[PDB]
Design a protein around this ligand. Sequence first.
Ligand SMILES: CCCCCCCCCCCCCCCCCC(=O)OC[C@H](COP(=O)(O)OCCN)OC(=O)CCCCCCCCCCCCCCCCC
Ligand SMILES: NC(=O)C1=CN([C@@H]2O[C@H](COP(=O)(O)OP(=O)(O)OC[C@H]3O[C@@H](n4cnc5c(N)ncnc54)[C@H](OP(=O)(O)O)[C@@H]3O)[C@@H](O)[C@H]2O)C=CC1
Ligand code: SF4
Ligand code: SF4
Ligand code: SF4
Ligand SMILES: [Zn+2]
Lengths: 146, 208, 156, 48, 114, 297, 381, 95, 176
Amino acid sequence: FAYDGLKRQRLTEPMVRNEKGLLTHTTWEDALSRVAGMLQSCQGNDVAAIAGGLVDAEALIALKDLLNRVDSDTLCTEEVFPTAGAGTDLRSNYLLNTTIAGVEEADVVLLVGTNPRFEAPLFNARIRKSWLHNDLKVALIGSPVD
Amino acid sequence: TRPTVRPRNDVAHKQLSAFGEYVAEILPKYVQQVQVSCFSELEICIHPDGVIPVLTFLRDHSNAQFKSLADLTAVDIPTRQNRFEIVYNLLSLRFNSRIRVKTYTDELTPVESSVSVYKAANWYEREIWDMFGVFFANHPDLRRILTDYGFEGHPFRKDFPLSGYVELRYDDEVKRVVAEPVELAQEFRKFDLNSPWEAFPAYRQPPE
Amino acid sequence: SRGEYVVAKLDDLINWARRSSLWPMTFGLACCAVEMMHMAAPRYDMDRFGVVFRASPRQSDVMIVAGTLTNKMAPALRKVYDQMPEPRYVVSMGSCANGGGYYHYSYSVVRGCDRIVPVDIYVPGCPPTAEALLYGILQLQKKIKREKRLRIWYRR
Amino acid sequence: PTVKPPTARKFIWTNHKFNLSGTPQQYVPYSTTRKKIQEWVPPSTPYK
Amino acid sequence: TSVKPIFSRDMNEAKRRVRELYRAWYREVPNTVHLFQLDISVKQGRDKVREMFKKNAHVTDPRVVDLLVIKGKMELEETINVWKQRTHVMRFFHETEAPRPKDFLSKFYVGHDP
Amino acid sequence: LHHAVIPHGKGGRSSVSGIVATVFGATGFLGRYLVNHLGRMGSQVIVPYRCEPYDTMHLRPMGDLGQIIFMDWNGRDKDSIRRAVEHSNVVINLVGREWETKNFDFEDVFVKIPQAIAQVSKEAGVEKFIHISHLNADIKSSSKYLRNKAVGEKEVRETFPEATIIKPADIFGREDRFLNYFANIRSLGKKTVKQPVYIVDVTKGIINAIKDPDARGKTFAFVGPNRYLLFDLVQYVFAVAHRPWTTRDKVERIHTTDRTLPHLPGLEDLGVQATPLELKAIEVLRRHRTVQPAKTV
Amino acid sequence: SNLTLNFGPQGVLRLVMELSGEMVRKCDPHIGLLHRGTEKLIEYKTYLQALPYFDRLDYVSMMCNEQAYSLAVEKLLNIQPPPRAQWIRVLFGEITRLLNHIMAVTTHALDIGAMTPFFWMFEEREKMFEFYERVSGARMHAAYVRPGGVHQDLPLGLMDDIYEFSKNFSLRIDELEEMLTNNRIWRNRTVDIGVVTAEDALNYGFSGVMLRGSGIQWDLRKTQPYDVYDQVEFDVPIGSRGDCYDRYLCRVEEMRQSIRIISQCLNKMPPGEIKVDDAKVSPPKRAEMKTSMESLIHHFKLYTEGYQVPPGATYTAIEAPKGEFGVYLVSDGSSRPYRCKIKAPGFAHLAGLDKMSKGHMLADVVAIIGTQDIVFGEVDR
Amino acid sequence: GVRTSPTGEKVTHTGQVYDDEDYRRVRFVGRQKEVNENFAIDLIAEQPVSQVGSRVISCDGGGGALGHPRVYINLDKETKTGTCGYCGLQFRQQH
Amino acid sequence: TYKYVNLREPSMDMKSVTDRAAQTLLWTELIRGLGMTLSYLFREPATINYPFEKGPLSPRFRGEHALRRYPSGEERCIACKLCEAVCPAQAITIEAEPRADGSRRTTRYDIDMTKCIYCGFCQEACPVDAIVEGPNFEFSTETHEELLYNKEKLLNNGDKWEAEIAANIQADYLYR
Ligand SMILES: CCCCCCCCCCCCCCCCCC(=O)OC[C@H](COP(=O)(O)OCCN)OC(=O)CCCCCCCCCCCCCCCCC
Ligand SMILES: NC(=O)C1=CN([C@@H]2O[C@H](COP(=O)(O)OP(=O)(O)OC[C@H]3O[C@@H](n4cnc5c(N)ncnc54)[C@H](OP(=O)(O)O)[C@@H]3O)[C@@H](O)[C@H]2O)C=CC1
Ligand code: SF4
Ligand code: SF4
Ligand code: SF4
Ligand SMILES: [Zn+2]
């Protein structure tokens, strides 16, 4: 039911700041020229990048190649994952390594610090299906959420 | 099942089954299948090398005497490696009967032209060149008959869109009807009308 | 002024003579030709309006496009339209001539004859009745009646 | 209709009109639906 | 993988047919510019025939170039016999069409089409 | 930018081009091919017409459904001009006469009408205005045409400061009055030098001046690629057309040489390759038939 | 050398003539000028939706082509119409036959020069179009004969008017036949013109009068009979010389025998329903659509999806007035056709135009294009 | 019950009216915007709530076979009327 | 069951040969054709005086489209989209939403009358008799887009023509 936010508040035209500091409509040549004029004056840690929650892999590697052409490695996300130790070098310590389906094979689940009902609702539904049909033993470390 | 159900004609069914046995055993070199539908219509499915020997048999044999070529048809079925299915509808006036002769080709194998047998085909399979792209070898005048002269592609192929790729309009700069890429003011609205429940258990195909 | 009155009466005279003596060139493309022939038939009888039956294209006043305009015949339509002397008019008759109709999404159909020739009167139907085609021809005559060639010429 | 009159309604036109094609009262087509995709209206204050 | 041929047995007979078809088109182009009273030069029509022959130059199948020679013969028959009009001849010259964007940047500017 | 005027499609007939154009004088020689080239992009073209609507019929196949809106206008009435320009984002002015009439002289056509159109389009919020003058326009010129056209150029530049003024020299096409004037005259040869520009190049230049934001406030000179003397030009027209109504002002404008203006940009700065006379003069003059090309300077 | 003419499109037809003075050495009909791609548009539309395309193929034989397509779909559905719908189909099929033969004879006389029986017989044709408008609401393209029967029952008092028409129509045939049959100018334009042998007529795929003018005793209403043609009594006219004059006489006699059939159908119309009483094929009544739940579901699903036709291929041919009109319908099990080839007689007749106009003259070409009743809608599809 | 935008352009029963800065009003310049002046949402609000003495009412829109499919409406809510889903008429149990 | 047209042998006695020669030399059947044309000269012609006289029609006639209302002003159309589903030309385009009182109604109901084939499947598919193809056939236009009806034009056609549409449906609905 969130598809009707997809037709409200949409950014449909390129916007640049005028002399009053107000966002005004413009073409793609003007907007991309005013961005590339600042990108050509940057180098090193002069330019950074933050990705959001809804970003595809193609644009992620597009912006990573572009900010490596300026030699900028400050490429950040918003959701903080700890880089102490292996970090993101090995894929095992940031995946759901078992599977969503592997909950059907489990007998004990320890849910640490999470509310899987509202973070991953169908993962919670798969835990409940294992709870019902396979008699899964679930323990939660965290706040007593329903 | 008296008022609303079409009555079965078992006499013509048994007669067309006997004549299908007859054609299948006189010509085993080309006849691959023989089938009779539930509404008593006979189909002889042959190999494309035997277009001229089968059609001259049914035209000339005294038990067949299929003198008239009613219709000549291709059917595009893209899930086959021989996607085109050439259909000959034949009428015997002596025995008051109709027979269907069916063969096959892909885009590149030519089919032998049956203008030696039935001259009626001189336009019909010519139409099959214009609509499907099936070449017919040893045809006297094979060219397009229904589409426009500079038309590229073959329209009744099922990988060809409903509209074309080009549309015509008069342009006043060049003082000429010109062709441009097709742009509709309203798209043809594809409807998905197939019911997801099985209608006919008799035609059920076995699964894998 | 006097000259305005003179050119107004002369416009009324030449508009009377051009609408009361329309000669049609009828494209018998498709089923609308049958209903044009019924508009020429003794019931509706175009000839009593001064609208003669099957004049030649090089002396006709109105091109009635009656039937589907395919891609193969669109240059022939424009060529016959170009051979018509002025003032020439075009009546579009039925849905295929109007906008493509039942063959609008076809690969081989011009989607309306107004992609080819300038159209004055759009008569809708599939086919429009012969009485409806005659209504369209009388509306064409009324359009000719309110032309202002000599009034605008005197004002230019 | 003098003998068998039509059944009267509050919405049937009391004043019939003829064919108006060629007049300033003629029909002009238009889309009868509202705007689908709402745009982001940028704020009227400066960004400082 | 053994198929029935159309006219040619290998690629050399097919190149013979392509060569004779190109010869017939090269002879026909001045008559085509003359009797259709086209506004193009004879050199420009010959460049269009060269472009339409080199468009299909990558084909390495004898049956496909057989059907291409057959369709070029049909187009030449519709050109010699005056069956085409001036419009059908000039549809090879896409004059009234806009120039299509070629680079990435102008295609980015005009729309979504790759 | 409003949502209904964002360009969509592939630039064909049923696409949206984002141009809402009001072409004054579209029922003439330049307005014909301009409404043609605008309508093949999918532009909302507004055609104000003075003439009988019959004389607008050829403008009706030029666009998609609802794309050309015909409306009446008087050249002395600012109200109909405001009624025609109050929705447009570009206003092109193509109003002109080769001769003066009883109701309209050169001052009524070249001075008052462009000032009225440009002023009313200035007070209506129109972004782009395009005025069409002649290359040989001059205040002290011998012909009343070029005098009043230079005065109208000055007035348009001072009442619409961002207006694009365009100088074609002597336009040739199928419906022209330059090659067809020479082919039917059956005046003489003098020391007059002419470079004629082709009408599709003029139309492509007008449209590339609509699309370019850097063409605002410029003055362009649309000239062909070859300057010809008058005598051998006229003899080449008689050579192509297979041959052995006027005013004195037209004679003054044929024997007036086309000035070279290097300080004004041309068709090569709007992306338009100028089409020479030797490619299109046969297309113009094949009508007049019951060839050595002309020497330049 | 020899002359080559191009009688262009100034239906419509392009003709490339190779002449040898007055003679005709080669006749090449360039067609496709009304090719609209009907039988590709049929593939994306349901069976009810593909029905009105058949009205517009032979656009002077509308309810006949409706009947042929309806018989094809009902054959693939294994259902049959009620008897009253069958008698209505045969009745309006013979009224359609009168329409087509009036069009044929009067335009064949109009092109040769006899322009008067055109006007005389189109008043009768106007009255039969009033019969179509009374039965269906449209004067030409009725969309009336549907798979399952017909769309709607006859309005009260229609059969009395079909009686009053049929009582007087034989005098109209008689005054047409007075103007043309014994006329020496009409005989001089049609007797030695386009003689077709019976073996070449069978070989060229000719059908109808084009066979029966050459003495072949073949009519599909007798030999391969459909709805109630085995229950009506009529005669089949047979020619003797295979020319334009025998085909003219065959069409006049088929008007006579159609009047005979219409008299028998008026006297033998049974009571009953007019659709098949399977509401999974033909839609229910509007009074029971608005009351019954099953009937509303069946109304919804027939006017949105349509009936599913079982998978199979059929060639259903009827005797249209131009000859054997056939529909080769291929169904894949869905509610839309997979394929619909439309056999029309004018295609094979116009293919045989080149043999029929050998050794004749240029003004005999218009007589041969008249004796083959060629409507280019059915030729080009 | 029509209303009017500040542009002077009439508002339809949908609520559609072109914006002030929208070029597509140029099609109404010199011509008229054809709106219907009998808004059905205003005309159905003038109808009286029918007081009936049953728990379930039926509606066919009047005319029998000339109306809509016949539907049954439950009238258990005294807070609210039971509106016919087709014709918009509304009913109430009188107790 | 068959008859031979044109298989008569002419007689060869002197009587019938002289009859055929008198027919040749005295042009007797040509005088017969002149007599038939002279007979139609003295008949009343079949010509009605249009526009003042109209050709006869039936209540089933399929002319210009209109959207009907209930006898309370509420429009009959409830956006079920059966009429654009069955439309063989795809001339109907419908868009809908619930309006301010919750009723299932259309915001767009367009019929391209230049696409329309006038076969009346929309009026017979409509379960509430909303869209009808009424009696009007005299609605020729001078412009192509005037034959592209939106919902407002069709509702004005219904308000214009309801006094006749309701009587035609009253005369015909028992056959439906
Ligand atoms: C200085 C002042 C004078 C200026 C010069 C003018 C001198 C006089 C010229 C002739 C008359 C000019 C006026 C013409 C008619 C103007 C009014 C008009 O058009 O009325 C229309 C009316 C018919 O009305 P309508 O719309 O057709 O209705 C159909 C009914 N179902 O029409 C009618 O009722 C009949 C119209 C008849 C028109 C007049 C007759 C024709 C012209 C005759 C003279 C010229 C031709 C001479 C012969 C030519 C060669 C044979
Ligand atoms: N050789 C050339 O073509 C050149 C032309 N130009 C300029 O380009 C412009 C267009 O050229 P061109 O097409 O040849 O000219 P046209 O004469 O062919 O077209 C002029 C247009 O303006 C209209 N018009 C003329 N006078 C008036 C008036 N008084 N009031 C209202 N409308 C009027 C005409 O309509 P109507 O039919 O009603 O008269 C027509 O639509 C002109 O300004 C011309 O000076 C510049 C350089 C060269
Ligand atoms: S609008 Fe329809 S009935 Fe008319 S000619 Fe076209 S297909 Fe035939
Ligand atoms: S009459 Fe037929 S084509 Fe016209 S809108 Fe109704 S269903 Fe569609
Ligand atoms: S007009 Fe009738 S069929 Fe069409 S959407 Fe409205 S209620 Fe349904
Ligand atoms: Zn209700």
